[PDB]
């Protein structure tokens, strides 16, 4: 699943 360089 997505783990982006961005807050949840």
């Amino acid at each position: 699943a997505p783990a982006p360089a961005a807050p949840a």
Partner: antibody
Framework: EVKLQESGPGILQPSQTLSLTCSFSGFSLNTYGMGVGWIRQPSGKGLEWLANIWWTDDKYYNSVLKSRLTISKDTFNNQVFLKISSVDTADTATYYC?????????????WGQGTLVTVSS | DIELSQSPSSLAVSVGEKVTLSCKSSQSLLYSNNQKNYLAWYQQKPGQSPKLLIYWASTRESGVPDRFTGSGSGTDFTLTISSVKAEDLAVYYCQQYYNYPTFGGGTKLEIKR
């Protein structure tokens, strides 16, 4: 309209700490869902992402370079900073800062002109 | 992280012609729980900063002409330029944001004249 200007040393010595400043208008890290990214490009090579900082002051680092990177913002939230410690010849590149995509989206919407950084004695 | 692989490395195309730029991902960029593809395309013209073309694999940034089309799903993506203009000379990069951003090595679009 969004504007970004990179500021950097032009030249620094091997082992010294690179210090880059991103100054921006037309948006703020006061506002929700706003952030700034750093991307670099050696001459005639491709793009490498370095680090992102958001309005939450959450910091996300390139896993390979993590231990050498520091990213921060000021209280006015108009300027973002990137440090790279112990620079070597391979850190010679053009360094861009970018507005991260509106409402918490980690692609690079608008890029600054970029400052060239040479690692040389 | 996730590795992006772009082909061909360099394209030589006449004005008016149609080109297809490929971006292969080492892991699927399709999230089942929103059915979005976490891919963006950029255009870098000589001398300039990269400029956003496509996000979510298929959505044009406003101002981007309709002849640039983003497509694909999972691990296989394409940027189609339907009638190449001379101004399209550039290196085109794909970038995933499913995990921490990574870029493909880029495709250099050259004009055959």
């Amino acid at each position: 309209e969004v504007k970004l200007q990179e500021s950097g040393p032009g030249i620094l010595q091997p082992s010294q700490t690179l210090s880059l400043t991103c100054s921006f208008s037309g948006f703020s890290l006061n506002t929700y869902g706003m952030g700034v990214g750093w991307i670099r490009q050696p001459s005639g090579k491709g793009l490498e992402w370095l680090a992102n900082i958001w309005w939450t002051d959450d910091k996300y680092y390139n896993s390979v370079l993590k231990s050498r990177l520091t990213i921060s913002k000021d209280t006015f939230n108009n300027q973002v900073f990137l440090k790279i410690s112990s620079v070597d010849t391979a850190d010679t590149a053009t360094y861009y800062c970018a507005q991260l995509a509106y409402h918490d989206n980690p692609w690079f919407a608008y890029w600054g002109q970029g400052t060239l950084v040479t690692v040389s004695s | 992280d996730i590795e992006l692989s772009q082909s061909p490395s360099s394209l030589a195309v006449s004005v008016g012609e149609k080109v297809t730029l490929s971006c292969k991902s080492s892991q699927s960029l399709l999230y089942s729980n929103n059915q979005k593809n976490y891919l963006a395309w950029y255009q870098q013209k000589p001398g300039q900063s990269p400029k956003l073309l496509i996000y979510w694999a298929s959505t044009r940034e406003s101002g981007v002409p309709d002849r640039f089309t983003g497509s694909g799903s999972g691990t296989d993506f394409t940027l189609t330029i339907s009638s190449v203009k001379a101004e399209d000379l550039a290196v085109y990069y794909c970038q995933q944001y499913y995990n921490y951003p990574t870029f493909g090595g880029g495709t250099k679009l050259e004009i055959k004249r």
